[PDB]
């Protein structure tokens, strides 16, 4: 567990990692996956939730038997100019099925004009950087999340 919770760097939620701690959120369901999201998006790391994180990045089934842990890592994962190394998936043609990962970077075609692998005015890079800043409101600050399956 030390290699996970006490890890130096955490993964982005789109590229999440798979591998008595009771003594910010320790909600257990019916009773390890690593990534960083902002605090307001932690509620989507629960069964039956919707949103950009729950639908495009990390999806939990309603049949989930496990525990969702999280803590504020603003002190670690924020730079004063913004930490743009953490990203999430803004665009996707469908929602992920439970426990599915998407690390692709194909350009999202939002209009009739094909992209052919190039970002354009209506051709989006599908990942959006967080730009975590230490003075952001705590709901916008980064939270490390560990989901025990």
């Amino acid at each position: 567990f030390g290699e996970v919770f006490n890890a130096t760097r955490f993964a982005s939620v789109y590229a999440w990692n798979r591998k008595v701690l009771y003594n910010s959120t320790f909600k257990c369901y019916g009773v390890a996956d690593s990534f960083v999201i902002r605090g307001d998006e932690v509620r989507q790391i629960a069964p039956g939730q919707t949103g950009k994180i729950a639908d495009y990045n990390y999806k939990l089934p309603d049949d989930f038997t496990g525990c969702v842990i999280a803590w504020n890592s603003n002190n670690l994962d924020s730079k004063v100019g913004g930490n743009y190394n953490y990203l999430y998936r803004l665009f996707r043609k469908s929602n992920l099925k439970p426990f599915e990962r998407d690390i692709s970077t194909e350009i999202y075609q939002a209009g009739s004009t094909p992209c052919n692998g190039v970002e354009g005015f209506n051709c989006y890079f599908p990942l959006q950087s967080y730009g975590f800043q230490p003075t952001n409101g705590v709901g916008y600050q980064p939270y490390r999340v560990v989901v025990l399956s």
Partner: antibody
């Protein structure tokens, strides 16, 4: 990329309503998001709202919530913007702008109209 | 609304940077910062979209970037054709936009 054609200048009186047309000029608005942006004399650009010519998704700025109605007839490929109960500070140039997009134009608007001056006279 | 200086200026050839301050729910949250060039009378023209990308035909002397809640547009080698109003704008998070107040860019004569 100015290509949309808008209706002629309008002269209205306080409390009247106005409707500005914006004809696609050769495109088909079925694959176009449409936005409306106004500029009052001596002020900056002001986003009024947007409608999707694909599925009709609409959103309006909180300033104009309840006062504006945007529609599209892709039959004629024409966008329409109605502004109700004009005040004197509604005197502005009104632009329609578009982009090839079936959803929201996150990057903004690529294609523009020439503008339509609407004067609420005193 | 976003915040812009009223006036930015330089002599022909110099570099000018116009800053634009937003919040963590628009500028800080997205890479959908677009800069519009405007001359009252004509229609707005996109100069920079995304945050730093140039539509084709826009001179490479236009560049853009952002840091935290502050975006910026830099024009290198100022030319008289660049004198105009410039508006920063951003996706605001709920299928909407937020505009700055505009900045007049003057080629100092």
């Amino acid at each position: 990329q100015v290509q949309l054609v808008q209706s002629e200048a309008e002269v209205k009186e306080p409390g009247a309503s106005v409707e500005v047309s914006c004809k696609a000029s050769g495109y088909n608005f079925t694959n176009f998001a449409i936005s409306w942006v106004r500029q009052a004399p001596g002020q900056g650009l002001e986003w009024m709202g947007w409608i999707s010519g694909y599925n009709g998704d609409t959103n309006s700025a909180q300033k104009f919530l309840g006062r504006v109605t945007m529609t599209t007839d892709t039959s004629t490929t024409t966008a329409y913007m109605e502004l109700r109960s004009l005040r004197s500070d509604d005197t502005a140039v009104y632009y329609c702008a578009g982009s090839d997009n079936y959803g929201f134009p996150y990057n903004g608007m690529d294609v523009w109209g020439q503008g339509t001056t609407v004067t609420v006279f005193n | 609304a976003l915040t812009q200086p009223p006036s930015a200026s330089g002599s022909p050839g110099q570099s000018v940077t116009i800053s634009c301050t937003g919040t963590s729910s628009d500028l800080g949250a997205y890479h959908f910062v677009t800069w519009y060039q405007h001359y009252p009378g004509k229609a707005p023209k996109v100069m920079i979209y995304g945050v730093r990308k140039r539509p084709s035909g826009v001179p490479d002397r236009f560049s853009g970037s952002k840091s935290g809640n502050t975006a910026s547009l830099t024009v290198s080698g100022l030319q008289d054709e660049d004198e105009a109003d410039y508006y920063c704008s951003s996706y605001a998070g709920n299928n909407d936009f937020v505009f700055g107040g505009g900045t007049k860019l003057t080629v100092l004569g």
